[PDB]
Write a protein that binds this ligand. Structure first.
Ligand SMILES: CO[C@@H]1O[C@H](CS[C@]2(C(=O)O)C[C@H](O)[C@@H](NC(C)=O)[C@H]([C@H](O)[C@H](O)CO)O2)[C@H](O)[C@H](O)[C@H]1O
Ligand SMILES: CO[C@@H]1O[C@H](CS[C@]2(C(=O)O)C[C@H](O)[C@@H](NC(C)=O)[C@H]([C@H](O)[C@H](O)CO)O2)[C@H](O)[C@H](O)[C@H]1O
Ligand SMILES: CC(=O)N[C@H]1[C@H]([C@H](O)[C@H](O)CO)OC(C(=O)O)=C[C@@H]1O
Ligand SMILES: CC(=O)N[C@H]1[C@H]([C@H](O)[C@H](O)CO)OC(C(=O)O)=C[C@@H]1O
Lengths: 446, 446
């Protein structure tokens, strides 16, 4: 009898929440922040660093995890992980609360990093990278980044198995997990991923030449056409890692009593994907979406529809929201409209919230950071391809923030739609960051 | 099969930690705060108020609870309690983390306040006072404060039974749990409760003329022996609650599947006890103590030796740790030495740490608010009968704070002793307070 959310939630997890062909996506907006049970551990010392939140939830249980670095967020020697496996429940007065059932600190010699979780029928699958050298150091590591598929079962026990990267990520130099969540689809769990591709490798050659240029809604990038093409053509090998091709990619693994069984990579064509970066594998109802961080020139939040057959996947022309920009360094700030070759941004995923009877997406929820270049002013709101709804603010004052990963669901019992935005926040006295789960109820005008 | 601490801990919970005869109690001291699994939920909204912690850990599991008011700590409207049942575990590296197994939000049609939890073999026993009026108002409500004995079972479910206060606390006008953890002894759960006595009632006339005068160690009170007796006599009828007799008591309930089964109140004779205040029932080894907050004139930490005979217990002359003082308010400041009438102070307890082979208590661990009147600057450390050891600070700046309670334990394996100190700390952005569980390893100078 494995852990399941309370009955008030059954049928309201990971499904298409608001199907309204009439009303305007934006008429829907986030209410003020709600007080729920804060299930994400805060730093217990003045220097402790807790970052990189990853979270997924299936119709039965939810998974969560983050990074813990004793000395400070800058130290990159060792560090452990925190994992949680729980279920949603309600109080007599119908308040909701994330009730973790298994809370453990996974800490041993091995230094995992940038890990992603996903709710599977066995427990909480986690995809990790185990590093020695720094990111910069590893991208030069001719040999591909070491990876391991782990899992925290309903029994509180943890087990993992390193994946044979010398083959799996053969044509790579660096290869880390998208940090965003993974999703379970057809007995398989699909994680996002990116990293470096060994130049001139079989893999590097098919992408060689392939580019793609997504544009802003109302801003037509001036710079001549020949200029834009060439720029994009190179936006896949930024100077940050010495021209190395940072390619997107999606890994799948068979979900069974054997961790890391039947892995399979799927390297989409840059003719459709953009510069590789952190991403999340979403699943709402019957649709699937690959979220990709805006680490390149494109600023608007993206969403590449995903389809699966066999053990591989297929991306498609991305859904986009212009109001959903992210802070980033010039020439790739929040308003950037021209293809360039940078590498910045921050993880801030959009959650599919409103569809059409024809099951096409329309509205999304998530937490952006209003600010051209710096990582400031968290902001929660509903977004359509163009505009933004009334917003709710973490703070009406300038505020330091980081990764924000959202997720919505409904309490059928109290017919209400809630959204969970796990946001990295600045913190005093106890470390650099506090990973707090903001909770909002989706309300609509009249 | 019930939950239980990893074997590395078995034998190191609720026992005498240090048995020394010559070593100076103060030669031991707290390590720098450690980085462990923050198991205490933090606010999630800008106004959420989380206060009044309560902790108790038996040889098998640990219980924890705190209160939560939505609109800010001053609002008296409604409120709900957060609960957690868990056990201690270790990582591959041998680090420790409090792994909670049952995490819930108790919120309903009732308002529970000033609750105290205790680890019973049936789960996590809780005692709360259900309020429908403010404290001042209830201290004038001829009738007794309604209460209930509840319990979060190992299965996750919570159950409670209202007590027949009109008979049980028949001689009281108000009565609440000491907020400080209770203890399980001889098949009954024991809680420290306090409140106001119904003037002229049997329970009240017997404490007539009874008092005690606790003096500081070095200092000496000038005042006449006459002026002293009176002051001490009237310290039990302070002016904050209309001269009512603020009384101290201990409630025992039988631990069984029937909640509230055969409870029994014990009202110690004021020839030994000071004015009624928040308390706690500690059990270290074969020794039972009673901690009494210093809401009256006596500044030093108090630990009343508690012996038990069936359903009733007896108290003895306290152990005073004259260095372990609390912030008061003139004339009852941290330095106070003469008997007076006041209802101030704060909750900051001392856990029985160091013992004589003859079981006599020699030293204690705790965290005091190192100030004279205001509630500022936390500070952890070992305390003997007269002085404080080296100190570990939350911060070296002026830091606002409040309640703090501590429990220590030994990791039999590496034979290392640790003290967990839960303290309400000042917080920013998210609520007026953040309850952070502090962790420290007790060290010996050389
Ligand atoms: C000067 O007017 C202020 O208007 C504020 C609007 S509502 C809200 C917001 O910005 O969304 C609701 C948020 O949940 C709240 N933040 C948190 C963390 O709970 C936010 C803060 O209160 C705001 O940032 C104030 O600093 O407010 C709100 O009514 C303020 O109280 C008004 O003073
Ligand atoms: C203020 O100068 C530094 O003091 C440090 C003392 S140790 C310690 C303390 O106050 O005991 C250890 C505490 O765990 C730590 N606080 C937290 C929350 O982790 C505290 C603060 O880090 C310090 O106080 C800063 O405010 O420090 C130590 O000697 C340092 O080397 C000094 O530079
Ligand atoms: C593997 C790794 O180092 N991840 C880091 C990531 C990375 O630098 C970026 O995705 C460029 O690849 O960025 C950041 C960051 O706060 O922005 C934090 C992550 O820890
Ligand atoms: C029942 C109740 O109200 N308890 C309160 C307690 C009480 O007032 C004291 O024991 C006598 O004054 O004080 C405080 C406080 O920070 O001091 C908080 C508690 O909420």
């Amino acid at each position: 009898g494995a852990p399941i959310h309370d009955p008030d939630f059954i049928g309201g997890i990971g499904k298409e929440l608001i199907v309204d062909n009439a009303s305007d996506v934006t008429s829907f907006y986030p209410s003020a922040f709600q007080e729920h049970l804060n299930f994400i551990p805060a730093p217990t010392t003045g220097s402790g660093c807790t970052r990189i939140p990853s979270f997924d939830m299936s119709a039965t249980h939810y998974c969560y995890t983050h990074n813990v670095i004793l000395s400070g967020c800058r130290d990159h020697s060792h560090s452990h992980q925190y994992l949680a496996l729980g279920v949603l429940r309600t109080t007599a007065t119908g308040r909701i609360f994330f009730s973790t059932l298994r809370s453990i600190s996974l800490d041993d010699t091995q230094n995992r990093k940038s890990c992603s979780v996903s709710a599977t029928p066995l427990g909480c699958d986690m995809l990790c990278s185990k590093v020695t050298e720094t990111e910069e150091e590893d991208y030069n590591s001719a040999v591909p980044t070491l990876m391991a598929h782990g899992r925290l079962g309903f029994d509180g026990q943890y087990h993992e198995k390193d994946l044979d990267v010398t083959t799996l990520f053969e044509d790579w130099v660096a290869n880390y997990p998208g940090v965003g969540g993974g999703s379970f689809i057809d007995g398989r769990v699909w994680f996002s991923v990116y990293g470096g591709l060994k130049p001139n490798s079989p893999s590097d050659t098919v992408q060689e030449g392939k580019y793609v240029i997504y544009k802003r809604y109302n801003d037509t990038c001036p710079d001549e056409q020949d200029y834009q093409i060439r720029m994009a053509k190179s936006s896949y090998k930024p100077g940050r890692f010495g021209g190395k091709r940072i390619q997107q990619a999606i890994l799948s693994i068979k979900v069974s009593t054997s961790l890391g069984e039947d892995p399979v990579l799927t390297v989409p064509p840059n003719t459709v994907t953009l510069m590789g970066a952190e991403g999340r594998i979403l699943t709402v109802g019957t649709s699937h979406f690959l979220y990709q961080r805006g680490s390149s020139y494109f600023s608007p939040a993206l969403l590449y529809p995903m389809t699966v057959s066999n053990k591989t996947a297929t991306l498609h022309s991305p859904y986009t929201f212009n109001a959903f920009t992210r802070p980033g360094s010039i020439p790739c700030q929040a308003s950037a409209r021209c293809p360039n070759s940078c590498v910045t941004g921050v993880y801030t995923d959009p959650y599919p919230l409103i569809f059409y009877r024809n099951h096409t997406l329309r509205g999304v929820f998530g937490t952006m950071l209003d600010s051209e270049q710096a990582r400031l002013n968290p902001a929660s709101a509903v977004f359509d391809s163009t505009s933004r709804s009334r917003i709710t603010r973490v703070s009406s004052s300038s505020t330091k923030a980081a990764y924000t990963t959202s997720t919505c669901f409904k309490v059928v019992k109290t017919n209400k739609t809630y959204c969970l935005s796990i946001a990295e926040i600045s913190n005093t006295l106890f470390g650099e960051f506090r990973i707090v789960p903001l909770l909002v109820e989706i309300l609509k005008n009249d």
